Every structure is written in structure tokens, then in C-alpha cells.
Amino acid sequence: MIIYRDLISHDEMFSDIYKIREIADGLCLEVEGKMVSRTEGESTVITGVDIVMNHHLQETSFTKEAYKKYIKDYMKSIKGKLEEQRPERVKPFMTGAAEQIKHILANFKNYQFFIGENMNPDGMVALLDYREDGVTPYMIFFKDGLEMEKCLEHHHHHH
């Protein structure tokens, strides 16, 4: 199993037990999830996205203008990480990131916003939307903002 973690915050984001597809010419990953129902805890049944509940992702809120401010700083920070670790990626990342930001802002009303369990404001903001079938959730992550953890057995909850 591969655990995908936030390059900035080191929080767990998802694992390769889900269907993962690359979009935006390798800039983003779309991770397909399922709605699940669990008891929480007079107790109540809660329903949510398995990606969110399994990895303890935390919902947050943005105005469109606040997200614009956040995402320009985030893409600058990933640029710096690439200059340190993967210099060959910097130029195509800048190009793709600017266009993907345009896409996200144009489709802004169609996303919910999630961050890692420790809620670092400099970490990645994952985007939740639903497929046309109106039942399947999926989440968008920035591929260059992830690090991979190998885990053959007995995955540990850590950051």
C-alpha cells in the first residue's frame, strides 16, 4: 500500500486503496470515493465520504477571494519545494498551476474544501465534488504537493 501525504504538513491525505486517476496533464489526482455510514457517539448515524472519514480530513470554508489568496501562496510554496527536490518539474508546474487555478475558480461553487487532520493552513486543500451519477464522490489533490509513504502491512496513524 502507498499512503499519500501532504508534502508541506505531512498529514495523511489518502491511500492507493482508492481508484486514483491523473488529470490536468499530471498536475492533479482525482481519487474516487464512496459514501459510508457510521455510528458516532444518544448516538446518531453519520454519513460521509470514505476518503474523508478514513483519513480524518477536516472540512473548512473559503470565500472565493480568500481561496484565491490562499492558493497563490500554496502554489508558491510547492514551487519552492520543487526547486529544492525536483528542479526539472518547476517550469511545467507553474504553467499547469496557473491554468488549474483558473479552472477551480470558474467551478468554485461545485467544491467543498478539506484539509489534513492537523489543519495546517499552509497544507493542501483537497476539493470534493460528485460525479454525474449523483452518488459517487471524488476528491482532487495536487500531485506535486504529495509525498509517498510505503506500507506493506499494519499502517500506522502518524504525521
Author numbering: 1 to 41, 63 to 180
What does the original paper state about this entry?
Histamine-Releasing Factor (HRF), also referred to as Translationally Controlled Tumour Protein (TCTP), p21, p23 and fortilin, is ubiquitously expressed in eukaryotes, and involved in apoptosis, cell cycle progression, cell proliferation and cancer (Bommer and Thiele, 2004, Nagano-Ito and Ichikawa, 2012, Bommer, 2012). In addition to its diverse range of intracellular roles, HRF is also able to activate mast cells and basophils, with the release of histamine, implicating a role in allergic disease. HRF can form dimers, and a disulphide-linked dimer was shown to be crucial for the cytokine-like activity of rat HRF. mHRF, hHRF and rat HRF contain two cysteine residues, at positions 28 and 172, and Cys172 is suggested to be the site of the intermolecular disulphide bond. The current model for the activity of HRF in mast cell activation involves cross-linking of FcεRI-bound IgE by dimeric HRF, mediated by interactions between HRF and the Fab regions of IgE.
The structure of hHRF-1, solved at 1.75 Å resolution, contains two molecules in the asymmetric unit. Residues 1–41 and 62–180, and 1–40 and 64–180 were modeled for chains A and B of the hHRF-1 structure, respectively, and as in the mHRF structure, a substantial portion of the mobile loop region was disordered.Fig. 2 hHRF-1. One hHRF structure, and the mHRF structure, contain non-covalent HRF interactions, but reveal different packing arrangements.
